[PDB]
Amino acid sequence: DTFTEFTNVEEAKKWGNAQYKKYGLSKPEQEAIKFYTRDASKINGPLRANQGNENGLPADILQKVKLIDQSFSKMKMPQNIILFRGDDPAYLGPEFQDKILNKDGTINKTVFEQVKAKFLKKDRTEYGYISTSLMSAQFGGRPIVTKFKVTNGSKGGYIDPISYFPGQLEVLLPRNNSYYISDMQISPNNRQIMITAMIFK
Numbered sequence: 001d002t003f004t005e006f007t008n009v010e011e012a013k014k015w016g017n018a019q020y021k022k023y024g025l026s027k028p029e030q031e032a033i034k035f036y037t038r039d040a041s042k043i044n045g046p047l048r049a050n051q052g053n054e055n056g057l058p059a060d061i062l063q064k065v066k067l068i069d070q071s072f073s074k075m076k077m078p079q080n081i082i083l084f085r086g087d088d089p090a091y092l093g094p095e096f097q098d099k100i101l102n103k104d105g106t107i108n109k110t111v112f113e114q115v116k117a118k119f120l121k122k123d124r125t126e127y128g129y130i131s132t133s134l135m136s137a138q139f140g141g142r143p144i145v146t147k148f149k150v151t152n153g154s155k156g157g158y159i160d161p162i163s164y165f166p167g168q169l170e171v172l173l174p175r176n177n178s179y180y181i182s183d184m185q186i187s188p189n190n191r192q193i194m195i196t197a198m199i200f201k
Contacts, residue, residue: 003149005082012134012169016158023074023157030162032067033172036129038164043068044128044175052127052176065175068129072174075157083132083148083156083171086139092119101143106190115193116184123178124197130173134158138168146195148179154201173199 006012025033036043043064050056054065089097092115099111132148139145150156156173163170183196 001080001152003080003082003151006134009135009169013160016134016160016169016171019075019078020158020161023071025071025074025162026067029067029071029074032064033071033159034162034164035064036068036172037131037159037162037168037170040128040131044126047127047129047175050127068172069175072155072157075155075172077150077152077154077156080149080151081134081171083134083150083173084136084139085130085132085146085148086142087144087146089143091144100193107186107193109186112184112186112193119181119195120184121181123180125176125178127175129175130156130177130179132171132173134169134171142192144193144195146197148173148197148199149182150199154199 004015006015043061046057046061047054047065054062054069057065089100092100096111096115096118100108100115102108130148133139136145136147150173154173155177156171159170159172160166160168177199179197179199181195181197183194185194186192187194
């Protein structure tokens with residue numbers, strides 16, 4: 001089946017709202033997700049620190065992580081969907097973060113080959129949750145943009161109605177969520193890396 005890519009904010013909120021209405025997230029689930037949206041680093045940072053071992057987390061963060069994890073029992077994609085995330089060169093790791101951009105702001109083409117060797121057609125797992133949006137335009141100036149293709153039934157949910165930052169049209173996906181990088185390209189303007197990644201659960 002096609003993957004839906006929302007063409008505008010109105011249609012996106014319509015689809016997101018329709019799914020959100022079915023979640024029945026608990027009060028503590030909602031508050032934990034809202035806290036995450038206020039500053040995701042307060043959750044994803046500790047998860048990275050502890051290499052996903054929720055048991056090494058501070059007790060307050062553990063309680064929120066268990067809630068956010070639990071929320072995904074209620075939030076599954078109803079259709080194959082396209083989601084977006086912007087990022088900076090640190091996404092590529094210390095050995096590339098300061099080399100992937102030329103001084104003139106374009107992607108270093110030779111270094112990009114090594115970036116592909118490291119990442120392309122390989123799975124990657126992040127210890128943090130994945131924050132995406134239904135829409136892509138807000139990422140047009142970021143050094144890296146990822147298009148996630150997420151199939152029907154995969155865990156994840158539209159959280160804009162409970163976000164600290166309404167209008168971001170965020171779809172949150174689980175932590176420790178392996179994705180497959182299926183494509184990586186330098187953009188037409190030579191100033192962005194465009195990644196496609198695939199998630200099936």
